[PDB]
Structure 1
Amino acid sequence: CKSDVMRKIKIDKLVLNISVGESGDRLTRAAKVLETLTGQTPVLSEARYTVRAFSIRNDQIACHVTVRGAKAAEILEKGLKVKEFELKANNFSATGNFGFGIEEHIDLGLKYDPQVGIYGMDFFVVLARPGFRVSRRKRMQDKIGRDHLLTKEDAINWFKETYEGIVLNK
Protein backbone atom coordinates (compact mmCIF):
# COMPACT_ATOMS: atom_id res chain seq x y z
CA CYS A 1 0.00 0.00 0.00
CA LYS A 2 3.09 2.20 0.03
CA SER A 3 2.84 5.23 -2.25
CA ASP A 4 6.20 4.62 -3.95
CA VAL A 5 4.35 3.62 -7.13
CA MET A 6 3.45 7.26 -7.76
CA ARG A 7 7.13 8.21 -7.32
CA LYS A 8 8.46 5.90 -10.05
CA ILE A 9 10.57 7.76 -12.61
CA LYS A 10 9.63 7.27 -16.26
CA ILE A 11 10.84 8.83 -19.50
CA ASP A 12 7.98 10.97 -20.78
CA LYS A 13 9.69 12.76 -23.68
CA LEU A 14 12.70 12.21 -25.94
CA VAL A 15 13.70 14.98 -28.36
CA LEU A 16 15.95 14.37 -31.37
CA ASN A 17 17.34 17.53 -32.95
CA ILE A 18 19.38 17.96 -36.14
CA SER A 19 20.93 21.41 -36.54
CA VAL A 20 22.24 22.25 -40.01
CA GLY A 21 23.22 25.74 -41.06
CA GLU A 22 21.62 25.78 -44.52
CA SER A 23 18.07 25.75 -45.87
CA GLY A 24 17.28 23.22 -48.58
CA ASP A 25 19.03 20.07 -49.78
CA ARG A 26 20.50 19.33 -46.35
CA LEU A 27 17.37 20.21 -44.37
CA THR A 28 15.13 18.21 -46.71
CA ARG A 29 17.33 15.15 -46.16
CA ALA A 30 17.77 15.83 -42.44
CA ALA A 31 14.00 15.81 -41.98
CA LYS A 32 13.75 12.59 -44.00
CA VAL A 33 16.07 10.57 -41.77
CA LEU A 34 14.28 11.71 -38.61
CA GLU A 35 10.95 10.67 -40.15
CA THR A 36 12.31 7.24 -41.06
CA LEU A 37 13.91 6.79 -37.63
CA THR A 38 10.83 7.63 -35.54
CA GLY A 39 7.75 7.47 -37.75
CA GLN A 40 6.34 10.99 -37.48
CA THR A 41 6.91 14.16 -39.46
CA PRO A 42 9.39 16.50 -37.75
CA VAL A 43 9.24 20.30 -37.75
CA LEU A 44 11.51 22.79 -39.48
CA SER A 45 12.89 25.35 -37.03
CA GLU A 46 13.64 28.87 -38.23
CA ALA A 47 16.37 31.15 -36.91
CA ARG A 48 15.53 33.69 -34.22
CA TYR A 49 18.19 36.33 -34.92
CA THR A 50 20.33 36.58 -38.04
CA VAL A 51 24.06 36.02 -37.56
CA ARG A 52 26.38 36.89 -40.45
CA ALA A 53 29.19 34.93 -38.79
CA PHE A 54 27.21 31.69 -39.19
CA SER A 55 25.54 32.95 -42.40
CA ILE A 56 21.97 32.73 -41.13
CA ARG A 57 16.51 35.20 -39.72
CA ASN A 58 13.39 33.61 -41.21
CA ASP A 59 15.37 30.86 -42.97
CA GLN A 60 14.64 27.33 -41.80
CA ILE A 61 17.73 25.95 -40.06
CA ALA A 62 17.09 22.84 -37.97
CA CYS A 63 14.61 20.00 -37.57
CA HIS A 64 13.44 18.31 -34.38
CA VAL A 65 10.78 15.90 -33.16
CA THR A 66 9.67 14.38 -29.86
CA VAL A 67 8.63 10.77 -29.29
CA ARG A 68 6.79 9.49 -26.22
CA GLY A 69 5.71 6.13 -24.88
CA ALA A 70 7.26 2.82 -25.87
CA LYS A 71 8.79 4.39 -28.98
CA ALA A 72 10.81 6.84 -26.87
CA ALA A 73 12.28 4.07 -24.71
CA GLU A 74 13.27 1.96 -27.72
CA ILE A 75 15.06 4.76 -29.58
CA LEU A 76 16.88 5.79 -26.40
CA GLU A 77 18.29 2.27 -26.08
CA LYS A 78 19.65 2.50 -29.62
CA GLY A 79 21.14 5.89 -28.81
CA LEU A 80 22.70 4.45 -25.67
CA LYS A 81 23.83 1.35 -27.57
CA VAL A 82 26.20 3.36 -29.77
CA LYS A 83 27.20 5.37 -26.69
CA GLU A 84 27.80 1.97 -25.01
CA PHE A 85 25.97 3.14 -21.86
CA GLU A 86 28.89 5.48 -21.11
CA LEU A 87 27.60 8.79 -19.75
CA LYS A 88 29.58 11.45 -17.91
CA ALA A 89 28.26 12.75 -14.61
CA ASN A 90 28.07 16.22 -16.20
CA ASN A 91 25.59 15.14 -18.89
CA PHE A 92 22.74 15.37 -16.35
CA SER A 93 20.96 18.67 -15.76
CA ALA A 94 20.14 20.03 -12.32
CA THR A 95 16.44 19.58 -13.17
CA GLY A 96 16.80 15.81 -13.57
CA ASN A 97 17.10 15.53 -17.36
CA PHE A 98 20.10 14.54 -19.46
CA GLY A 99 21.25 14.18 -23.03
CA PHE A 100 24.09 13.23 -25.34
CA GLY A 101 25.17 13.43 -28.95
CA ILE A 102 25.55 11.13 -31.95
CA GLU A 103 27.96 11.70 -34.84
CA GLU A 104 26.83 8.96 -37.26
CA HIS A 105 23.21 7.88 -37.58
CA ILE A 106 23.35 4.11 -38.01
CA ASP A 107 19.95 3.65 -39.76
CA LEU A 108 20.48 2.17 -43.23
CA GLY A 109 24.09 2.14 -44.40
CA LEU A 110 23.47 -0.40 -47.16
CA LYS A 111 22.10 2.09 -49.69
CA TYR A 112 23.90 5.00 -48.06
CA ASP A 113 23.96 7.29 -51.06
CA PRO A 114 25.53 10.76 -51.19
CA GLN A 115 21.93 11.95 -51.48
CA VAL A 116 21.08 10.83 -47.94
CA GLY A 117 24.58 11.45 -46.61
CA ILE A 118 25.61 11.14 -42.97
CA TYR A 119 23.94 13.29 -40.31
CA GLY A 120 24.81 13.63 -36.65
CA MET A 121 22.11 13.83 -34.01
CA ASP A 122 21.62 14.85 -30.40
CA PHE A 123 19.45 12.99 -27.90
CA PHE A 124 17.75 14.76 -25.01
CA VAL A 125 15.65 12.81 -22.52
CA VAL A 126 13.14 14.45 -20.18
CA LEU A 127 12.24 12.36 -17.15
CA ALA A 128 9.05 12.70 -15.12
CA ARG A 129 6.84 11.12 -12.46
CA PRO A 130 3.16 10.18 -12.43
CA GLY A 131 1.60 13.41 -11.24
CA PHE A 132 3.49 15.92 -13.36
CA ARG A 133 0.29 16.75 -15.25
CA VAL A 134 -0.67 19.28 -12.56
CA SER A 135 1.67 21.78 -14.25
CA ARG A 136 0.54 21.12 -17.84
CA ARG A 137 -3.24 20.80 -17.55
CA LYS A 138 -5.44 23.66 -18.71
CA ARG A 139 -7.56 23.99 -15.55
CA MET A 140 -5.95 24.75 -12.17
CA GLN A 141 -2.39 24.57 -13.45
CA ASP A 142 0.06 24.56 -10.54
CA LYS A 143 3.66 23.89 -9.49
CA ILE A 144 4.89 20.43 -8.60
CA GLY A 145 6.20 20.08 -5.07
CA ARG A 146 9.93 20.39 -4.55
CA ASP A 147 10.29 16.89 -3.13
CA HIS A 148 8.26 15.45 -6.02
CA LEU A 149 10.49 17.09 -8.62
CA LEU A 150 13.52 15.15 -9.80
CA THR A 151 17.17 15.92 -9.06
CA LYS A 152 20.49 15.27 -10.76
CA GLU A 153 21.35 12.31 -8.53
CA ASP A 154 17.80 10.94 -8.73
CA ALA A 155 18.17 10.79 -12.52
CA ILE A 156 21.64 9.25 -12.17
CA ASN A 157 20.31 6.49 -9.92
CA TRP A 158 17.54 5.85 -12.45
CA PHE A 159 20.19 5.50 -15.17
CA LYS A 160 22.25 3.09 -13.05
CA GLU A 161 19.22 0.96 -12.15
CA THR A 162 17.21 0.52 -15.38
CA TYR A 163 20.15 0.25 -17.81
CA GLU A 164 23.18 -0.67 -15.64
CA GLY A 165 25.02 2.32 -17.03
CA ILE A 166 28.13 3.73 -15.42
CA VAL A 167 28.76 7.42 -14.72
CA LEU A 168 32.28 8.81 -15.08
CA ASN A 169 34.15 11.68 -13.45
CA LYS A 170 36.52 12.41 -16.35
Structure 2
Amino acid sequence: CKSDVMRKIKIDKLVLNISVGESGDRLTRAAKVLETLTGQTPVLSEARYTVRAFSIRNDQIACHVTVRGAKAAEILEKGLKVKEFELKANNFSATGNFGFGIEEHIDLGLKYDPQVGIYGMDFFVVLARPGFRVSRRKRMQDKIGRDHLLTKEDAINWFKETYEGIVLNK
Protein backbone atom coordinates (compact mmCIF):
# COMPACT_ATOMS: atom_id res chain seq x y z
CA CYS A 1 0.00 0.00 0.00
CA LYS A 2 3.09 2.20 0.09
CA SER A 3 2.67 5.38 -1.97
CA ASP A 4 6.06 4.98 -3.69
CA VAL A 5 4.13 4.27 -6.90
CA MET A 6 3.02 7.91 -6.71
CA ARG A 7 6.72 8.89 -6.56
CA LYS A 8 8.14 7.11 -9.63
CA ILE A 9 10.15 9.24 -12.05
CA LYS A 10 9.11 9.21 -15.71
CA ILE A 11 10.41 11.17 -18.70
CA ASP A 12 7.48 13.45 -19.55
CA LYS A 13 9.08 15.72 -22.17
CA LEU A 14 12.05 15.51 -24.53
CA VAL A 15 12.88 18.58 -26.62
CA LEU A 16 15.17 18.36 -29.65
CA ASN A 17 16.35 21.77 -30.89
CA ILE A 18 18.49 22.59 -33.92
CA SER A 19 19.88 26.13 -34.13
CA VAL A 20 21.17 27.65 -37.37
CA GLY A 21 22.12 31.27 -37.94
CA GLU A 22 20.27 31.58 -41.25
CA SER A 23 16.66 31.33 -42.40
CA GLY A 24 15.60 29.54 -45.56
CA ASP A 25 16.75 26.42 -47.41
CA ARG A 26 18.94 24.97 -44.66
CA LEU A 27 16.18 25.70 -42.13
CA THR A 28 13.80 23.52 -44.14
CA ARG A 29 16.40 20.74 -44.13
CA ALA A 30 16.79 21.19 -40.37
CA ALA A 31 13.01 20.90 -40.04
CA LYS A 32 13.05 17.91 -42.40
CA VAL A 33 15.38 15.76 -40.29
CA LEU A 34 13.32 16.57 -37.19
CA GLU A 35 10.17 15.30 -38.90
CA THR A 36 11.84 12.01 -39.87
CA LEU A 37 13.24 11.41 -36.39
CA THR A 38 10.00 12.13 -34.48
CA GLY A 39 7.08 12.09 -36.93
CA GLN A 40 5.51 15.50 -36.21
CA THR A 41 6.08 18.87 -37.83
CA PRO A 42 8.47 21.00 -35.73
CA VAL A 43 8.00 24.67 -34.85
CA LEU A 44 10.36 27.24 -36.38
CA SER A 45 11.54 29.52 -33.59
CA GLU A 46 12.08 33.13 -34.66
CA ALA A 47 14.61 35.55 -33.20
CA ARG A 48 13.61 37.99 -30.47
CA TYR A 49 16.58 40.39 -30.69
CA THR A 50 18.43 41.23 -33.91
CA VAL A 51 22.22 41.30 -33.54
CA ARG A 52 24.51 41.98 -36.50
CA ALA A 53 27.31 39.99 -34.85
CA PHE A 54 25.34 36.78 -35.45
CA SER A 55 23.59 38.13 -38.59
CA ILE A 56 20.09 37.66 -37.20
CA ARG A 57 14.15 39.78 -35.51
CA ASN A 58 11.30 38.22 -37.48
CA ASP A 59 13.75 35.85 -39.20
CA GLN A 60 13.47 32.24 -38.03
CA ILE A 61 16.69 31.03 -36.41
CA ALA A 62 16.04 27.61 -34.89
CA CYS A 63 13.52 24.78 -34.97
CA HIS A 64 12.51 22.46 -32.15
CA VAL A 65 9.98 19.81 -31.19
CA THR A 66 9.03 17.89 -28.05
CA VAL A 67 8.03 14.23 -27.71
CA ARG A 68 6.29 12.48 -24.82
CA GLY A 69 5.48 8.90 -23.92
CA ALA A 70 7.08 5.86 -25.53
CA LYS A 71 8.34 7.94 -28.46
CA ALA A 72 10.44 10.14 -26.16
CA ALA A 73 11.95 7.11 -24.42
CA GLU A 74 12.98 5.39 -27.66
CA ILE A 75 14.37 8.61 -29.16
CA LEU A 76 16.30 9.28 -25.95
CA GLU A 77 17.78 5.77 -26.13
CA LYS A 78 19.44 6.55 -29.47
CA GLY A 79 20.85 9.81 -28.12
CA LEU A 80 22.34 8.11 -25.07
CA LYS A 81 23.51 5.16 -27.19
CA VAL A 82 25.41 7.45 -29.56
CA LYS A 83 26.75 9.12 -26.40
CA GLU A 84 27.83 5.67 -25.11
CA PHE A 85 25.72 6.32 -22.00
CA GLU A 86 28.42 8.71 -20.76
CA LEU A 87 26.99 11.86 -19.17
CA LYS A 88 29.02 14.33 -17.14
CA ALA A 89 27.85 15.29 -13.65
CA ASN A 90 27.56 18.97 -14.62
CA ASN A 91 24.93 18.32 -17.30
CA PHE A 92 22.16 17.76 -14.75
CA SER A 93 20.18 20.86 -13.81
CA ALA A 94 19.35 21.77 -10.22
CA THR A 95 15.64 21.28 -11.03
CA GLY A 96 16.05 17.63 -12.05
CA ASN A 97 16.46 18.06 -15.82
CA PHE A 98 19.49 17.30 -17.96
CA GLY A 99 20.63 17.54 -21.55
CA PHE A 100 23.43 17.03 -24.04
CA GLY A 101 24.31 17.62 -27.67
CA ILE A 102 24.77 15.33 -30.65
CA GLU A 103 27.19 16.22 -33.44
CA GLU A 104 26.34 13.71 -36.18
CA HIS A 105 22.69 12.73 -36.59
CA ILE A 106 22.67 9.12 -37.76
CA ASP A 107 19.16 9.26 -39.31
CA LEU A 108 19.87 7.65 -42.67
CA GLY A 109 23.39 6.65 -43.66
CA LEU A 110 23.11 4.93 -47.03
CA LYS A 111 21.45 7.72 -49.03
CA TYR A 112 23.04 10.71 -47.31
CA ASP A 113 23.41 13.50 -49.86
CA PRO A 114 24.81 17.04 -49.63
CA GLN A 115 21.27 18.32 -50.25
CA VAL A 116 20.27 16.98 -46.83
CA GLY A 117 23.64 17.89 -45.32
CA ILE A 118 24.72 17.18 -41.76
CA TYR A 119 23.23 18.73 -38.63
CA GLY A 120 24.03 18.89 -34.93
CA MET A 121 21.18 18.26 -32.51
CA ASP A 122 20.75 18.83 -28.79
CA PHE A 123 18.66 16.65 -26.49
CA PHE A 124 17.05 18.14 -23.39
CA VAL A 125 15.11 15.78 -21.13
CA VAL A 126 12.56 17.02 -18.60
CA LEU A 127 11.86 14.54 -15.81
CA ALA A 128 8.62 14.43 -13.86
CA ARG A 129 6.67 12.57 -11.18
CA PRO A 130 2.94 11.82 -11.01
CA GLY A 131 1.11 14.81 -9.58
CA PHE A 132 3.05 17.48 -11.48
CA ARG A 133 -0.20 18.36 -13.29
CA VAL A 134 -1.29 20.57 -10.38
CA SER A 135 1.14 23.20 -11.69
CA ARG A 136 0.05 22.67 -15.31
CA ARG A 137 -3.76 22.54 -15.29
CA LYS A 138 -6.17 25.44 -15.78
CA ARG A 139 -8.29 25.33 -12.61
CA MET A 140 -6.69 25.41 -9.14
CA GLN A 141 -3.08 25.86 -10.19
CA ASP A 142 -0.56 25.44 -7.37
CA LYS A 143 3.12 24.64 -6.83
CA ILE A 144 4.40 21.11 -6.29
CA GLY A 145 5.84 20.47 -2.86
CA ARG A 146 9.60 20.68 -2.43
CA ASP A 147 9.82 17.06 -1.27
CA HIS A 148 7.85 15.95 -4.34
CA LEU A 149 9.95 18.08 -6.69
CA LEU A 150 12.97 16.54 -8.39
CA THR A 151 16.49 17.63 -7.49
CA LYS A 152 19.81 17.06 -9.23
CA GLU A 153 20.68 13.82 -7.43
CA ASP A 154 17.31 12.15 -8.03
CA ALA A 155 17.78 12.76 -11.75
CA ILE A 156 21.36 11.45 -11.62
CA ASN A 157 20.29 8.32 -9.73
CA TRP A 158 17.40 7.77 -12.16
CA PHE A 159 19.80 7.83 -15.11
CA LYS A 160 21.93 5.19 -13.38
CA GLU A 161 18.99 2.97 -12.38
CA THR A 162 17.22 3.04 -15.77
CA TYR A 163 20.04 3.00 -18.34
CA GLU A 164 23.10 2.02 -16.25
CA GLY A 165 24.87 5.06 -17.67
CA ILE A 166 27.62 6.08 -15.27
CA VAL A 167 28.28 9.73 -14.46
CA LEU A 168 31.48 11.63 -15.22
CA ASN A 169 32.99 13.90 -12.56
CA LYS A 170 36.26 14.94 -14.24
So what's the TM-score if we normalise by structure 2? 0.99
Per the TM alignment, residue 30 of structure 1 is displaced from its structure 2 partner at its CA by 0.2
Aligned to 1:4: 4
1:94-153 Cα deviation digits (max 9, x unpaired): 000000000000000111111000000000000000000000000000000000000000
1:58-80 Cα deviation digits (max 9, x unpaired): 10110000000000000000000
Within 5 A, what are the aligned runs for 1:1-170? 1-170=1-170
1:18-72 Cα deviation digits (max 9, x unpaired): 0000001110100000000000000000000001000001101100000000000
Residue 31 of structure 1 aligns to a residue in which SS? helix
Which consecutive residues of structure 1, in runs of 5 or more, have no partner in the other structure?
A: none
Work out the CA distance in 1 between the residues paired with 2:156 and 2:26: 36
Residue 29 of structure 1 aligns to a residue in which SS? helix
Residue 14 of structure 1 aligns to a residue in which SS? strand
Work out the CA distance in 2 between the residues paired with 1:109 and 1:44: 25
So what's the TM-score if we normalise by structure 1? 0.99
Identity between Structure 1 and Structure 2 (%): 100
For the aligned residues, what is the CA RMSD? 0.4
Work out the CA distance in 2 between the residues paired with 1:168 and 1:86: 7
Which consecutive residues of structure 2, in runs of 5 or more, have no partner in the other structure?
A: none
Work out the CA distance in 2 between the residues paired with 1:70 and 1:29: 26
Work out the CA distance in 2 between the residues paired with 1:89 and 1:169: 5
Work out the CA distance in 2 between the residues paired with 1:33 and 1:66: 14
Q: How many residues align?
A: 170
Work out the CA distance in 1 between the residues paired with 2:120 and 2:62: 12
Work out the CA distance in 1 between the residues paired with 2:108 and 2:159: 28
Work out the CA distance in 2 between the residues paired with 1:162 and 1:66: 21
Residue 90 of structure 1 aligns to a residue in which SS? coil
